[PDB]
Amino acid sequence: GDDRELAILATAENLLEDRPLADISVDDLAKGAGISRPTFYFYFPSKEAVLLTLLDRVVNQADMALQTLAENPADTDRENMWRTGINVFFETFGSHKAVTRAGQAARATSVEVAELWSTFMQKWIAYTAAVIDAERDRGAAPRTLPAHELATALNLMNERTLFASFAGEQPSVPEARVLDTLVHIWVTSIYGE
Amino acid sequence: GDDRELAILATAENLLEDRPLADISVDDLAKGAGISRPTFYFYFPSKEAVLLTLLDRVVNQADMALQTLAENPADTDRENMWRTGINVFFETFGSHKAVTRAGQAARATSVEVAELWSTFMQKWIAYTAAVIDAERDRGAAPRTLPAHELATALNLMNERTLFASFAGEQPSVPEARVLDTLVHIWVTSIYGE
Ligand SMILES: CCCCNC(=O)N1CCC(C)CC1
Ligand SMILES: CCCCNC(=O)N1CCC(C)CC1
């Protein structure tokens, strides 16, 4: 069954907790999944292609949850709306730190990964700008910055800040504090004059 | 004269505009500086060590300018103070995009570079938190987030946002708009309730 593919994906994710991809081998991957090295190469052309697929799953999972969120409005409080949105990325990527970590590094080498970050970031920034615009129309938010430019910076702040937190980088916001920090900065940049 | 070292530094920076370090060679570096490959190795043990030195110069230049700024206060306007601070990093790194670009990528491989970003970021975040605290004491800023946590996120936003702008990443704030965007988000997160 294809589900050997499922087995390669789980072997990889597991191993990426312990060491970078560079220090992970196709032997290591095939072994974990309980297939031969040549049977591995039937399912994925490279180690790098396996990362890509994982990052794709994680990214689409985040996207899907944000689509679920947008199709029903949680009963009022503007701050809570934002907190609930940003939580989608905190939880989704926070459940996949290993993948999140390797994906981000791979952006410097794998334009195929870079393109995948880029696509999904553009989409999410577009969604951010539409909510700010909608909020500006209702009269709740002042027309300050260009909405899309503001949305871009805010999304970039969240990419950088969440992943530094996840990787325990120095410096970083503690993970148990990161959510409140971003929301404060989001709400206050969106609604403030 | 050592100033062969100066010549290796300028050859490298020049070339890093055209191609990544990976595609740049010690031959290329020695040639540009007008020395032999073995004379090169007297001055720097690797290509990677040359990057490091450049990033060090650029980082200290930014730091020094921020020290100049702090030792005399520009006549009032809280927003302008911040704009003037952030401008230091916009101008300094914006004059060294090639170096800025290669330094950032090298963080994923060269813990010696990672450590250099880390050190200087910690310092700048500390300075940010001290200005917010000072501002909170004068009574001008509300005691909202922990000052250091806020300073960290804001600095990370600026690292991510400025370098995406510089590299023409999609997505990004246009460079001619990036300054205003960050300041708005800075001022409004610092002074807003
Ligand atoms: C509707 C609110 C969207 C919030 N966006 C958000 O949290 N992002 C921060 C995390 C990165 C990975 C994607 C963009
Ligand atoms: C006193 C204000 C400091 C502003 N900090 C700032 O603009 N930074 C953003 C750019 C990165 C490279 C370092 C931190």
GROMACS .gro file of C-alpha atoms in nm, chain B:
model
  193
  194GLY     CA    1   5.042   4.569   0.392
  195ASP     CA    2   4.756   4.401   0.580
  196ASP     CA    3   4.550   4.619   0.343
  197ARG     CA    4   4.546   4.305   0.129
  198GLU     CA    5   4.288   4.207   0.394
  199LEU     CA    6   4.092   4.526   0.305
  200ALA     CA    7   4.122   4.410  -0.058
  201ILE     CA    8   3.984   4.062   0.013
  202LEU     CA    9   3.691   4.221   0.201
  203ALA     CA   10   3.599   4.453  -0.088
  204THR     CA   11   3.643   4.171  -0.354
  205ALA     CA   12   3.401   3.952  -0.153
  206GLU     CA   13   3.137   4.218  -0.095
  207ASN     CA   14   3.146   4.310  -0.467
  208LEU     CA   15   3.107   3.946  -0.576
  209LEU     CA   16   2.828   3.871  -0.325
  210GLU     CA   17   2.609   4.117  -0.521
  211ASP     CA   18   2.628   3.881  -0.827
  212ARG     CA   19   2.613   3.532  -0.676
  213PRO     CA   20   2.593   3.346  -0.341
  214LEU     CA   21   2.911   3.255  -0.151
  215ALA     CA   22   2.855   2.889  -0.248
  216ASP     CA   23   2.913   2.998  -0.612
  217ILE     CA   24   3.210   3.220  -0.517
  218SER     CA   25   3.562   3.071  -0.506
  219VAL     CA   26   3.887   3.144  -0.317
  220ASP     CA   27   4.043   3.173  -0.667
  221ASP     CA   28   3.776   3.435  -0.738
  222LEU     CA   29   3.859   3.608  -0.407
  223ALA     CA   30   4.241   3.598  -0.438
  224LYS     CA   31   4.220   3.703  -0.805
  225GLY     CA   32   3.999   4.007  -0.721
  226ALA     CA   33   4.232   4.115  -0.441
  227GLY     CA   34   4.537   4.062  -0.669
  228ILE     CA   35   4.715   3.799  -0.453
  229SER     CA   36   4.787   3.427  -0.480
  230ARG     CA   37   4.552   3.159  -0.341
  231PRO     CA   38   4.816   3.069  -0.074
  232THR     CA   39   4.864   3.437   0.020
  233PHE     CA   40   4.481   3.447   0.060
  234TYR     CA   41   4.503   3.166   0.321
  235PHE     CA   42   4.743   3.375   0.530
  236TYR     CA   43   4.470   3.631   0.588
  237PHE     CA   44   4.156   3.412   0.620
  238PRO     CA   45   4.121   3.035   0.686
  239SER     CA   46   3.801   3.004   0.471
  240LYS     CA   47   3.556   3.183   0.243
  241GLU     CA   48   3.318   3.152   0.537
  242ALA     CA   49   3.559   3.342   0.765
  243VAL     CA   50   3.565   3.632   0.513
  244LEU     CA   51   3.178   3.653   0.528
  245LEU     CA   52   3.194   3.648   0.904
  246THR     CA   53   3.440   3.942   0.909
  247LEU     CA   54   3.221   4.144   0.673
  248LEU     CA   55   2.912   4.073   0.873
  249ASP     CA   56   3.106   4.178   1.181
  250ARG     CA   57   3.199   4.517   1.029
  251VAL     CA   58   2.839   4.584   0.914
  252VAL     CA   59   2.693   4.482   1.252
  253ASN     CA   60   2.939   4.695   1.453
  254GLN     CA   61   2.883   4.991   1.220
  255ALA     CA   62   2.508   4.968   1.296
  256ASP     CA   63   2.581   4.930   1.667
  257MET     CA   64   2.820   5.233   1.671
  258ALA     CA   65   2.567   5.456   1.496
  259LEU     CA   66   2.305   5.353   1.748
  260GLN     CA   67   2.559   5.448   2.027
  261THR     CA   68   2.604   5.792   1.858
  262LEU     CA   69   2.232   5.834   1.845
  263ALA     CA   70   2.176   5.749   2.219
  264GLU     CA   71   2.446   5.997   2.346
  265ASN     CA   72   2.250   6.307   2.234
  266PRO     CA   73   1.864   6.337   2.224
  267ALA     CA   74   1.710   6.477   1.897
  268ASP     CA   75   1.472   6.764   1.997
  269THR     CA   76   1.145   6.581   2.105
  270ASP     CA   77   0.856   6.400   1.922
  271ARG     CA   78   0.832   6.041   2.044
  272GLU     CA   79   0.746   5.902   1.700
  273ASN     CA   80   1.052   6.074   1.543
  274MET     CA   81   1.282   5.927   1.809
  275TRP     CA   82   1.176   5.577   1.703
  276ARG     CA   83   1.183   5.660   1.332
  277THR     CA   84   1.538   5.792   1.378
  278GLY     CA   85   1.647   5.472   1.561
  279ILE     CA   86   1.498   5.224   1.315
  280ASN     CA   87   1.650   5.437   1.028
  281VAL     CA   88   1.995   5.343   1.162
  282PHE     CA   89   1.928   4.975   1.066
  283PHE     CA   90   1.742   5.059   0.743
  284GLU     CA   91   2.037   5.270   0.617
  285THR     CA   92   2.322   5.064   0.757
  286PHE     CA   93   2.204   4.721   0.631
  287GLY     CA   94   2.039   4.878   0.324
  288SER     CA   95   2.388   4.990   0.220
  289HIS     CA   96   2.510   4.628   0.259
  290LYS     CA   97   2.231   4.412   0.120
  291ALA     CA   98   2.470   4.153  -0.029
  292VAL     CA   99   2.644   4.108   0.300
  293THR     CA  100   2.312   4.133   0.486
  294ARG     CA  101   2.167   3.858   0.257
  295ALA     CA  102   2.465   3.614   0.289
  296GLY     CA  103   2.500   3.671   0.662
  297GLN     CA  104   2.141   3.580   0.719
  298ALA     CA  105   2.163   3.260   0.511
  299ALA     CA  106   2.492   3.161   0.685
  300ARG     CA  107   2.305   3.158   1.022
  301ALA     CA  108   2.169   2.812   0.930
  302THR     CA  109   2.521   2.662   0.897
  303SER     CA  110   2.777   2.885   1.076
  304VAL     CA  111   2.705   2.889   1.451
  305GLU     CA  112   2.986   3.148   1.463
  306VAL     CA  113   2.766   3.379   1.250
  307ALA     CA  114   2.449   3.277   1.439
  308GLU     CA  115   2.626   3.374   1.765
  309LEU     CA  116   2.722   3.714   1.617
  310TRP     CA  117   2.357   3.791   1.514
  311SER     CA  118   2.243   3.664   1.851
  312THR     CA  119   2.488   3.883   2.057
  313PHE     CA  120   2.406   4.202   1.872
  314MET     CA  121   2.032   4.136   1.867
  315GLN     CA  122   2.031   4.079   2.243
  316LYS     CA  123   2.208   4.414   2.291
  317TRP     CA  124   1.969   4.607   2.068
  318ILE     CA  125   1.660   4.445   2.223
  319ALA     CA  126   1.802   4.542   2.566
  320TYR     CA  127   1.841   4.898   2.446
  321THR     CA  128   1.485   4.894   2.309
  322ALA     CA  129   1.344   4.771   2.643
  323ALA     CA  130   1.539   5.045   2.835
  324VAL     CA  131   1.389   5.320   2.615
  325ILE     CA  132   1.037   5.174   2.659
  326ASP     CA  133   1.094   5.153   3.037
  327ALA     CA  134   1.226   5.510   3.049
  328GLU     CA  135   0.920   5.618   2.850
  329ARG     CA  136   0.692   5.427   3.092
  330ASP     CA  137   0.860   5.606   3.387
  331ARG     CA  138   0.816   5.959   3.239
  332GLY     CA  139   0.446   5.856   3.219
  333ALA     CA  140   0.435   5.872   2.837
  334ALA     CA  141   0.380   5.494   2.774
  335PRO     CA  142   0.124   5.262   2.948
  336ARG     CA  143   0.256   4.959   3.137
  337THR     CA  144   0.114   4.698   2.893
  338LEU     CA  145   0.333   4.403   2.792
  339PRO     CA  146   0.656   4.314   2.967
  340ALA     CA  147   0.890   4.570   2.805
  341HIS     CA  148   1.163   4.322   2.712
  342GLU     CA  149   0.914   4.076   2.557
  343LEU     CA  150   0.768   4.359   2.356
  344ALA     CA  151   1.108   4.483   2.254
  345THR     CA  152   1.206   4.130   2.134
  346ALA     CA  153   0.902   4.083   1.906
  347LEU     CA  154   0.943   4.435   1.757
  348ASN     CA  155   1.313   4.376   1.687
  349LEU     CA  156   1.234   4.037   1.531
  350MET     CA  157   0.966   4.200   1.314
  351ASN     CA  158   1.228   4.451   1.193
  352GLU     CA  159   1.491   4.182   1.118
  353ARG     CA  160   1.243   3.981   0.912
  354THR     CA  161   1.066   4.274   0.745
  355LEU     CA  162   1.380   4.480   0.653
  356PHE     CA  163   1.565   4.177   0.505
  357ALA     CA  164   1.261   4.060   0.297
  358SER     CA  165   1.233   4.414   0.160
  359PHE     CA  166   1.609   4.422   0.086
  360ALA     CA  167   1.605   4.082  -0.096
  361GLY     CA  168   1.290   4.178  -0.291
  362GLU     CA  169   1.114   3.871  -0.139
  363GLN     CA  170   0.757   3.797  -0.225
  364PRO     CA  171   0.587   3.886  -0.008
  365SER     CA  172   0.739   4.207   0.127
  366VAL     CA  173   0.680   4.565   0.213
  367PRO     CA  174   0.818   4.786  -0.067
  368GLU     CA  175   1.147   4.938   0.053
  369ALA     CA  176   1.028   5.296  -0.001
  370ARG     CA  177   0.737   5.211   0.233
  371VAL     CA  178   0.907   4.984   0.486
  372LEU     CA  179   1.025   5.260   0.729
  373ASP     CA  180   0.682   5.412   0.782
  374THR     CA  181   0.527   5.069   0.832
  375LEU     CA  182   0.757   4.955   1.113
  376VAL     CA  183   0.742   5.292   1.296
  377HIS     CA  184   0.359   5.290   1.294
  378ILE     CA  185   0.366   4.939   1.440
  379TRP     CA  186   0.642   5.038   1.691
  380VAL     CA  187   0.480   5.366   1.813
  381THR     CA  188   0.131   5.219   1.831
  382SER     CA  189   0.238   4.905   2.024
  383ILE     CA  190   0.449   5.106   2.266
  384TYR     CA  191   0.208   5.396   2.341
  385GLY     CA  192  -0.132   5.226   2.287
  386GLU     CA  193  -0.365   5.075   2.550
   0.00000   0.00000   0.00000
